[PDB]
């Protein structure tokens, strides 16, 4: 019995419903009337929430905006009324017979007025040099959409060497993205330098915001 | 009803390690009980499930070496993992599926052989010459550290703070965590709390 749901769902405006669609390649359907399809929630750095079972029994705590409908092998959820908090990843599931199978999950997106990324640039905390350790670091925080790049400049040089990139999932309370980028390297190598740019050429105004010291 | 796993943590390939899994609520000898396991790549995966009349069910990935077994009486779920191998490193979860499924928070299984490590908390504030004042951003990076699990918390009252996922260098972990408040309020002491519970550590430094 394998459940099948896109990875990603079509961009969602808030205060608007959004569908997440699901199938399994068996009937959910049992002859006591009961479909044995659930749902869960797996939100950014969050254990998974049950969200619906039984196909249309929702879980305490869960409100109302959420419903689940369908046949024995198609299904769908629907969200009413986004709010920024719905942001998270939603799987399919089936506990009809053993072995338990379950779907790849649905990315709810939500979709947002452009936002351009507020940097921060930092320099190696003392702590750090004192350690022999020098990385740069630089916040590119609640920026829309997810699409950016960010480039580093060691003394007017281009440099991607030691650069790490880290993204975080859709806010939510913002609907927005951020980034975080690390330039780490040795102290005597960050010595052998003065200035240090954090790049940031999101998809709008043409011009990079650019942040140094 | 509650479900509460534990036994997980820290094991060399080919170890062995026995999970539990306690309740509140539910009697464990009248379901299908399972245990259920994910790789932070996400998407849960089966990894056992033993019926009422005690009868036991495995995938072939863990076919001989996992062994699912239930105390009637004490009310309890075990998992005896046995020749552990990299690709069983995941959370595992103990679940009573049928009907409405309960889970438990989970337990960490990590199978490696390099050293666990406490993490290098550094803080991040604006040096000097830096555009502030209205709303500035604050951070700590922390690096250095093995056992992923680690967890970030700033004065416990934060709305604008930004975690950032893990990411593997060296065979140690590195993360940031960035928040941002008005210097209106930026004289008030802003701490950042980094918690590693497989280290046992607690690091806590308040920015300038």
């Known amino acids: 019995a394998a459940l099948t749901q896109s990875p990603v769902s079509n961009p969602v405006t808030l205060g608007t419903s959004a569908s997440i669609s699901c199938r399994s390649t068996k009937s959910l359907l049992h002859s006591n009337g009961i479909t044995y399809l659930y749902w869960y929630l797996q939100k950014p750095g969050q254990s998974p929430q049950l969200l619906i079972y039984q196909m249309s029994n929702l879980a305490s705590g869960v409100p109302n905006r959420f419903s689940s409908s369908g046949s024995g092998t198609d299904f769908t959820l629907r969200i009413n009324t986004v709010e920024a908090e719905d942001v998270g990843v939603y799987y399919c599931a089936q506990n009809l017979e053993l072995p338990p199978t379950f779907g790849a999950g649905t990315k709810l997106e939500l979709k947002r007025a452009d936002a351009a990324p507020t940097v921060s640039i930092f320099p190696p905390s003392s702590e750090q040099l004192t350690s022999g350790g020098a990385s740069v670091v630089c916040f590119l925080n609640n920026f829309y959409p997810k699409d950016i790049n960010v480039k580093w400049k060691i003394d007017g040089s281009e440099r991607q060497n030691g650069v790490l990139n880290s993204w975080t999932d859709q806010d939510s309370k913002d609907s927005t993205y951020s980034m975080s980028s690390t330039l780490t390297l040795t102290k005597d190598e960050y010595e052998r330098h003065n200035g240090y740019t954090c790049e940031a050429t999101h998809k709008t105004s043409t011009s990079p915001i650019v942040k140094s010291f | 009803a509650a479900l509460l796993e534990s036994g997980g943590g820290l094991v060399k390939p080919g170890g062995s390690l026995k999970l539990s899994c306690t309740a509140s609520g539910i009697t464990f000898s009248r379901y299908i009980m399972s245990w259920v396991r994910q790789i932070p790549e996400k998407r849960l995966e089966w990894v056992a499930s033993?019926?009422?009349?005690?009868?036991?069910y495995y995938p072939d990935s863990v076919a001989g070496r996992f062994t699912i077994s239930r105390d009637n009486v004490r009310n309890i779920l075990y998992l005896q993992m046995s020749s552990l191998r990299s690709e069983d490193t995941a959370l595992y979860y103990c679940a009573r599926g049928q009907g409405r499924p309960y889970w438990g928070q989970g337990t960490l299984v990590t199978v490696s052989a390099a050293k666990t490590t406490p993490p290098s908390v550094y803080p991040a504030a604006p040096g000097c010459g830096d555009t502030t004042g209205s709303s500035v951003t604050l951070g700590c990076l922390v690096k250095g550290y093995f056992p992923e699990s680690v967890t970030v918390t700033w004065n416990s009252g934060g709305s604008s703070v930004h975690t950032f996922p893990a990411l593997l260098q060296s065979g140690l972990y590195t993360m940031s965590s960035s928040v941002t408040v008005p210097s209106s309020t930026w004289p008030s002491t802003v701490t950042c709390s980094v918690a590693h519970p497989a280290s046992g550590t607690t690091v806590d430094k308040k920015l300038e």
């Open positions: 033993i019926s009422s009349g005690g009868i036991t």
